[PDB]
Amino acid sequence: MWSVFIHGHDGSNKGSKTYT
């Protein structure tokens, strides 16, 4: 399992998503 950090258009961190 790995995670990707999500950033908005502005660049601000919006969270993370997890994949398998």
Termini Cα distance of the chain: 5
Site string (1-20) toward other proteins, x via CB under 8 A: -xxxxxxxxxxx-x--x-x-
Nearest distance from C-beta of residue 20 to other proteins, angstroms: 9
Number of residues forming the site for other proteins (CB under 8 A): 14
Q: From start to end of 1-20, where are the E strands?
A: 2-7, 13-19
CA 16 and chain centroid, separation? 3
Nearest distance from C-beta of residue 5 to other proteins, angstroms: 5
Which chain residues interact with other proteins by CB under 8 A?
A: 2-12, 14, 17, 19
